[PDB]
Design a protein around this ligand. Structure first.
Ligand SMILES: CCC1=C(C)/C(=C/C2=NC(=C\c3[nH]c(/C=C4\NC(=O)[C@H](C)[C@H]4CC)c(C)c3CCC(=O)O)/C(CCC(=O)O)=C2C)NC1=O
Ligand SMILES: CCC1=C(C)/C(=C/C2=NC(=C\c3[nH]c(/C=C4\NC(=O)[C@H](C)[C@H]4CC)c(C)c3CCC(=O)O)/C(CCC(=O)O)=C2C)NC1=O
Ligand SMILES: CCC1=C(C)/C(=C/C2=NC(=C\c3[nH]c(/C=C4\NC(=O)[C@H](C)[C@H]4CC)c(C)c3CCC(=O)O)/C(CCC(=O)O)=C2C)NC1=O
Ligand SMILES: CCC1=C(C)/C(=C/C2=NC(=C\c3[nH]c(/C=C4\NC(=O)[C@H](C)[C@H]4CC)c(C)c3CCC(=O)O)/C(CCC(=O)O)=C2C)NC1=O
Ligand SMILES: CCC1=C(C)/C(=C/C2=NC(=C\c3[nH]c(/C=C4\NC(=O)[C@H](C)[C@H]4CC)c(C)c3CCC(=O)O)/C(CCC(=O)O)=C2C)NC1=O
Ligand SMILES: CCC1=C(C)/C(=C/C2=NC(=C\c3[nH]c(/C=C4\NC(=O)[C@H](C)[C@H]4CC)c(C)c3CCC(=O)O)/C(CCC(=O)O)=C2C)NC1=O
Ligand SMILES: CCC1=C(C)/C(=C/C2=NC(=C\c3[nH]c(/C=C4\NC(=O)[C@H](C)[C@H]4CC)c(C)c3CCC(=O)O)/C(CCC(=O)O)=C2C)NC1=O
Ligand SMILES: CCC1=C(C)/C(=C/C2=NC(=C\c3[nH]c(/C=C4\NC(=O)[C@H](C)[C@H]4CC)c(C)c3CCC(=O)O)/C(CCC(=O)O)=C2C)NC1=O
Ligand SMILES: CCC1=C(C)/C(=C/C2=NC(=C\c3[nH]c(/C=C4\NC(=O)[C@H](C)[C@H]4CC)c(C)c3CCC(=O)O)/C(CCC(=O)O)=C2C)NC1=O
Ligand SMILES: CCC1=C(C)/C(=C/C2=NC(=C\c3[nH]c(/C=C4\NC(=O)[C@H](C)[C@H]4CC)c(C)c3CCC(=O)O)/C(CCC(=O)O)=C2C)NC1=O
Ligand SMILES: CCC1=C(C)/C(=C/C2=NC(=C\c3[nH]c(/C=C4\NC(=O)[C@H](C)[C@H]4CC)c(C)c3CCC(=O)O)/C(CCC(=O)O)=C2C)NC1=O
Ligand SMILES: CCC1=C(C)/C(=C/C2=NC(=C\c3[nH]c(/C=C4\NC(=O)[C@H](C)[C@H]4CC)c(C)c3CCC(=O)O)/C(CCC(=O)O)=C2C)NC1=O
Lengths: 172, 282, 162, 162, 172, 162, 172, 162
């Protein structure tokens, strides 16, 4: 696992060159906007439960086949599993946001995740739709401009969207 | 009640299964934790570590279950415990190191001992490793931990008592303990006898209270005792040293005392310096 | 690596819980210290060549026998002097990686692991590199808390070699 | 408890290494946040009566059936009203403990651990406490980053109840 | 493991009530002197290896019977164990210094050490002497007035002495 | 699932031995009781609609607040009334399945597994289903040992919800 | 673990004599009233959760020191433990009732429970009080005369009272 | 011992669950068969002397060589005849115990355990006992289900010997 700082230093170690001035200033820029990153992750994690719950209700309303008898989100045990996996994806994406890199998202998630869903027979496309619902919810809550110091964090929001997109593409 | 009992913090589970099963650092931690649990917190020197097993461990060819078995059957483990102790004592140590518990009843010793007598020691370790308990509580990707403290699995109450006989502190190692070189839970296991909990030492005087019932009063009063109002409280003590007339005799012992006299008796005991282990109604 | 950010992330991951304020506070501290940390890293890298050559001469002076005795594990030959320069350069490059990473992750994973094995097989006594690191720690020419942290990492390496 | 300081100590202990710069940075971050954290804690504990009594009335309004329906799980009887006051006080007391501790440890060990079992056995629907916590999160009367810290811990409780 | 803040919280939890103004002031005093605490722990950790090594040489010079044949610090395996144990005591004391509370020192390291040494046969009094050698060395290293912004630190130094003393008394 | 026949099979499988006479006697008893069990199952399914509707009204009467309170997890909307007619039907269906299976297997696999999680995520109260199950147990209209078995399964569900 | 029939067989095997006619008739009497035994265990197990919950409410009303802070049944996790260890005793007593002997209850639940509670600090008097609270509720629920073909059950009720009492005395 | 009632109890205990209706049904079947079981046991024990002495003579006739050949394993001496009588009595006693216990428990604990080892060390050819078991199976003097269950257990013993 390599966060953003760790990632840049690891590639620089592979090349075997002292960190160059450009890399130094890139890292300084990362630190300068670090407070924003922390604020965004705090706000997302504070509403984690509501995000997952609302997204789940929406998914089962839009795709009733899942909760109909014989569907993969039936039997109340598989329903618990589905909620668990949605919140797991949210948890690892929040880890990724705090890190600044996608290394954690790919290691301990999405790696041999497509295959597991494919073998279980659970539709991966529906999983992607669920991830997208959570993406909209999280980006809205993470860009809410009320209750906080003013600023512009659109870059960080696009980064969050990128992480969610990566996951949804890997599972579907 | 954590510090006195000894369970400082045993409050999580260290798996190694990951996309980064090595995880570049976490594997170091897992290897250390396996050494601490399997070898009984023995101080393994760097030269004698089982390098061959760790090779396969990072490679992913072997799981944590296979790593634990490799240590358990390697001569590193055998020299410390297997070869040097009474066989029943070895069974107790296996239960402590591999399944993180203590023998719940005599049938456990019967079964494991018979395996040793016929099949050999390797098969005995095999039985612990692949017993349903090891397969469930741990998962071929989870280092064994002392789950005997927690009662969730389903166990005889005595188990709690018994595990505190084997674990005599965070610092302690089973190669080096007060009662070592002899069976610690053998006489009790045949009689299904409970054991008073001996707290491990913690920045105060320690007096390991051996409890051979060969010469002690019974757990109950078995009578009216003095007959004074109130029941009969059994008081234990270990370090009686001041009044040695022939030599005190039976320095660690218990006395069944009627309620009204307890206070007086207490001070007498404190005068000798023994720290009362327990005061249980009889 | 053991980078403060990823250490907090792992601490939350082993317990299967969303990042609590504990981990957020830790990362905040890392970002607060990062200003001085990056200043220190820039300082060490900008005069890296000077410090490397100075440390090489320091080891040559403290252990004259290493420049004279014949053998593969000595710098009597020019090739040996080149390898000595390469090694001390490795130590300085790793310390400047550790400064930027924010923790002792780089020093631990890319060095300090099996260091005993290598130093015992090829018979490079650790004392040589320890004295070289001491020279670096005395001539780094930093000031303030930046100097404090750079020294701390260097001394971590020193104690690890010992 | 899962206190930032103790978490760093445990992270160093499981590896067996002396406390590295990573852990020191983390605890420094905690100390830097502690000024605002203690201000927030003072605010909650000095205004406790208003917050708790108001929360009790808020849950009575949100769920009118809870103050009419006969049964021990409800607060229709005066004894149940006393129970409600005591438990809301416990929640506020734990949030103040968490604010001063600097992490979520105290509420993990003295609130959340096994909360599901209790809330199911004594028929204490979690939604009641969720709404009460919402009231406290709105009336705490904090500002700045102190408000952020207090709201973070309150929302930890809210999500744990859910 | 309890740290200072946790200790105060645990007492307050035992008694219920609510954090009193006195307790608040105590914790504020702890944080206003925190930089000192961190500096001390950094200095001790940075010189850990030399502290242990120097104290060990002194111990074996003062009590040669330990390293004479048949003594408990003989055979090069027990010597390794003895060095290990000295370093471990130093490590847990360093933990205690950073925490500000001695709970960690008595909960893991000193928890059972006495009976361990009693069974091994290792002379506890000699171990106490070794810990005291380390005490003087480490306190001198931390109290070195040159190298950092000057200021009052005597209270923290006395606290360090207290931790070392607790360990030394519990082993002997 | 935990059907008597299959658990006997698993018991023999763990020992690795052919089915001994004890297991055969057990499954013979199962077959002997199956005639009454299936008669009771027919009776329960023939009046299933009336039972489900009556239970839905019973919970509406015991908890009027649930038919007025606005929100997703309430039957104040026609969609919520549909959800009630769905879930209560599921519980009755599972009781019939348990009756046919002669064990709690179906109940565990299709209902009890993860029931605790679901009632907390969707803000459902177990008491609702408990009251509905009590109505079902009183109006099942079975007699004899078959009635005993059916009531046992219903009470299993009741205690699982609690 | 000895059930009634096994107990008779074992005591006949120790003496080495074929089962005497007296023992035969005793076992026949046990079989004759076996349906009553099964009915009782069925009733108690059907209402276990309510039994434990009601008895718990009563226990905390009669001994408030448990709920009061700093006690043993405070902090909501120890409350969970207390409920767990009341239902555990109920479970082992039901095992005993089905068996017809107290062997299982004294072998796997009450065999040293007193010492474990002593070490934890849990008040041993209060657990006995809790068992008695459960005793009256369970005996009443089993002796409920409505819902089954009427008959005699007084002997069986005395037997289960005996099991509860044995546990309550052994834990105090 | 491994008695039906205790086996069900242990199966429930390893999963920490209350005795569900499956186990209760099993024990009910045991009680229903117990009437015939006790009748058969009483019949066997009241006629035990005939079945022990006759079995002794039966093995003497099927194996003349066992009552003549010199050696401790043989019954040529009167002491050997006494040993033979005692062992046949043990087998008959165990069958009565098994019949009363309603399961294989007693037979496995007090006879079958290590039976091969003992017969292979003290030179006690199992054929002798299996012939004796056949005799007692033939003169069991039992009818109806009493007969069938008893003969089943006898058959268990013979299959265990061989
Ligand atoms: C414990 C972890 C942690 C958190 C959560 C945290 C919050 C935090 N946010 C801050 C500032 C800020 N936070 C924002 C955040 C935003 N601006 C926007 O327009 C958005 C809608 C939103 C981001 C999505 C901005 C713009 C600042 C001030 C400027 C800056 O720091 O970059 C600051 C610095 C000044 C202050 O507010 O005191 C802190 C300390 N600090 C922490 O140490
Ligand atoms: C059956 C006994 C046995 C063998 C053979 C074995 C091989 C083996 N060598 C390994 C590593 C390695 N082996 C090498 C070896 C080499 N690097 C080079 O430049 C050379 C060309 C070559 C030596 C001549 C390297 C570099 C690694 C490290 C891979 C890594 O961690 O990135 C690994 C990876 C996991 C680990 O390091 O434990 C395995 C499994 N393991 C075993 O238990
Ligand atoms: C160091 C190796 C070692 C020894 C020696 C040992 C002894 C030992 N012998 C046992 C049994 C036994 N041992 C005997 C021994 C004898 N009975 C007699 O009549 C004779 C006088 C004598 C043989 C000549 C008996 C009868 C039992 C069974 C006791 C019982 O089930 O109650 C048991 C009980 C548990 C079991 O049966 O599995 C142990 C622990 N255990 C060990 O691990
Ligand atoms: C993390 C907390 C912790 C501590 C402290 C601890 C102590 C500890 N020290 C040990 C050994 C030892 N301890 C010493 C100590 C000394 N000998 C001397 O002459 C000196 C006076 C002294 C050092 C100052 C020695 C020589 C051994 C090895 C004995 C042996 O294995 O034979 C052992 C067991 C034997 C072994 O090393 O396998 C333990 C368990 N264990 C722990 O888990
Ligand atoms: C008649 C049978 C009998 C025995 C066996 C007996 C043993 C015995 N020896 C004692 C003392 C003692 N025994 C020793 C013995 C030793 N010290 C050492 O350094 C050596 C390792 C070891 C001898 C080789 C010591 C030091 C004490 C005093 C302990 C103290 O005051 O702390 C004590 C403590 C109370 C007292 O001193 O009176 C007892 C009970 N007493 C008896 O009445
Ligand atoms: C990034 C981590 C890393 C380290 C630390 C490292 C060190 C390292 N230095 C080596 C050699 C060497 N290094 C030296 C260096 C010195 N000559 C002197 O006079 C001085 C005292 C000293 C410098 C301070 C010498 C002489 C050898 C050759 C030894 C031999 O071939 O026998 C070797 C053996 C293989 C080789 O020749 O490269 C290693 C592995 N390599 C690494 O990848
Ligand atoms: C320190 C952590 C801690 C928590 C959280 C805790 C909760 C807790 N609340 C309880 C009861 C209760 N809780 C309430 C609370 C309420 N009643 C209402 O009408 C409202 C809607 C609501 C307040 C908003 C009531 C009425 C009871 C008593 C229920 C009964 O007697 O059955 C009980 C049962 C024991 C008792 O009677 O007190 C526990 C264990 N206990 C703890 O030790
Ligand atoms: C990586 C996390 C981290 C650490 C470790 C840290 C330490 C730290 N402690 C400090 C303060 C201090 N440093 C001392 C040091 C001393 N004065 C003396 O006379 C003694 C000899 C000595 C006691 C060992 C004192 C008294 C203060 C307090 C005054 C202040 O805060 O500036 C300072 C500011 C001035 C200085 O460098 O001393 C820093 C940066 N800051 C951090 O962010
Ligand atoms: C096959 C077994 C099975 C069960 C038991 C089950 C329960 C279950 N009930 C649900 C919802 C629901 N359950 C109810 C039920 C009730 N509303 C009330 O007012 C009453 C008091 C009560 C009925 C008597 C309602 C209204 C919802 C919808 C809540 C929502 O969408 O948020 C949901 C969420 C998905 C949905 O909207 O259907 C599940 C998974 N699902 C299953 O697959
Ligand atoms: C299957 C047989 C069995 C029994 C009997 C049993 C008892 C038992 N109860 C325990 C804990 C406990 N039990 C209680 C119970 C109580 N608190 C109170 O206020 C009351 C007086 C009392 C209930 C009436 C508490 C509070 C603890 C936790 C103590 C602690 O962590 O400090 C523990 C310690 C480990 C754990 O937490 O599970 C055991 C072993 N465990 C078993 O497996
Ligand atoms: C699934 C396991 C199982 C159960 C549950 C079962 C019940 C059962 N209870 C019965 C009767 C009875 N039930 C009782 C019970 C009682 N008498 C009283 O005064 C008390 C209030 C109460 C104690 C619970 C009595 C006395 C009889 C008649 C005699 C008997 O069979 O026990 C009968 C026989 C007559 C009838 O059909 O009513 C059965 C079959 N049979 C079974 O195989
Ligand atoms: C309760 C279960 C049990 C069984 C089954 C059992 C068998 C048994 N039979 C034995 C001996 C014997 N058993 C016989 C029996 C026979 N001689 C014959 O001619 C016949 C063919 C046969 C009777 C059918 C004889 C003659 C001996 C003595 C053999 C000797 O001393 O070498 C012995 C040797 C110890 C002794 O001298 O008694 C055992 C252990 N012991 C047991 O505790």
């Amino acid at each position: 696992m390599l966060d953003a700082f760790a990632k840049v230093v690891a590639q620089a170690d592979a090349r075997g060159e002292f960190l160059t001035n450009a890399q130094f200033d890139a890292l300084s820029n990362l630190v300068k906007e670090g407070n924003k990153r922390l604020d965004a992750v705090n706000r997302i994690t504070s509403n984690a439960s509501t995000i997952v719950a609302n997204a789940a209700r929406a998914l089962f309303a839009e795709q009733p086949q899942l909760i109909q008898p014989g569907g993969n989100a039936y039997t109340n045990r598989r329903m618990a599993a589905c909620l668990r996996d949605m919140e797991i994806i949210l948890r690892y994406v929040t880890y990724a946001i705090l890190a600044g890199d996608s290394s954690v998202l790919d290691d301990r998630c999405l790696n041999g995740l497509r295959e597991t869903y494919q073998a279980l027979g659970t539709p991966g496309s529906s999983v992607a739709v669920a991830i997208q619902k959570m993406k909209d919810a999280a980006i809205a809550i993470a860009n809410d401009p009320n209750g906080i110091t003013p600023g512009d964090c659109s870059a960080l929001m696009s980064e969050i969207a990128g992480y969610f997109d990566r996951a949804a593409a890997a599972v579907a | 009640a954590a510090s006195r009992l000894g369970t400082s913090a045993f409050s999580d589970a260290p798996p190694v299964e990951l996309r980064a099963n090595w995880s570049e650092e976490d594997l170091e931690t897992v290897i250390r934790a396996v050494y601490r649990q399997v070898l009984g917190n023995d101080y393994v020197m760097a030269s004698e570590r089982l390098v061959s097993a760790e090779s396969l461990l990072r490679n992913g060819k072997i799981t944590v279950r296979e790593f634990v078995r490799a240590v358990a059957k390697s001569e590193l483990y055998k020299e410390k415990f297997l070869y040097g102790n009474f066989q029943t004592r070895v069974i107790e140590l296996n239960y402590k190191h591999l399944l993180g518990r203590a023998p719940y009843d005599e049938s456990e010793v019967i079964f494991h001992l018979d395996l040793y007598e016929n099949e050999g020691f390797d098969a005995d370790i095999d039985s612990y490793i692949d017993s349903p308990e090891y397969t469930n509580s741990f998962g071929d990707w989870v280092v064994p931990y002392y789950r005997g403290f927690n009662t969730q699995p389903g166990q005889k109450t005595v188990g709690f008592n018994r595990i505190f006989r084997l674990y005599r502190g965070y610092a302690n190692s089973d190669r080096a303990q007060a009662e070592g070189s002899m069976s610690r839970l053998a006489r009790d296991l045949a009689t299904n006898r409970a054991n008073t909990v001996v707290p491990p030492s913690n920045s105060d005087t320690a007096f390991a209270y051996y409890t051979p019932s060969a010469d002690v009063p019974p757990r109950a009063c078995l009578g009216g005792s003095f007959g004074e109002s109130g029941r009969v409280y059994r008081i234990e003590v270990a370090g009686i040293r001041q009044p040695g007339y022939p030599g005190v005799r039976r320095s660690s012992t218990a006395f069944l005392v009627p309620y009204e006299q307890l206070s007086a008796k207490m001070q007498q005991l404190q005068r000798t310096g023994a720290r009362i282990i327990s005061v249980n109604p009889a | 690596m053991k980078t403060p950010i990823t250490e907090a992330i792992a601490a939350a991951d082993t317990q299967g819980r969303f990042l609590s304020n504990t981990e957020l506070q830790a990362v905040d501290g890392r970002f607060k210290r990062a200003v001085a940390s990056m200043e220190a890293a820039r300082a060490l890298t900008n005069n890296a060549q000077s410090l490397i050559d100075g440390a090489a001469q320091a080891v040559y002076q403290k252990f004259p026998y290493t420049t004279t005795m014949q053998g593969s594990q000595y710098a009597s030959t020019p090739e040996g002097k080149a390898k000595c320069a390469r090694d001390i350069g490795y130590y300085l490059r790793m310390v400047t990686y550790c400064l930027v990473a924010g923790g002792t992750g780089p020093m631990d994973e890319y060095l300090i692991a099996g260091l005993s094995e290598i130093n015992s097989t090829f018979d490079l006594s650790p004392s040589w590199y320890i004295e070289a690191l001491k020279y670096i720690k005395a001539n780094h020419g930093l000031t303030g808390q930046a100097a404090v942290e750079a020294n701390a990492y260097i001394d971590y390496a020193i104690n690890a070699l010992s």
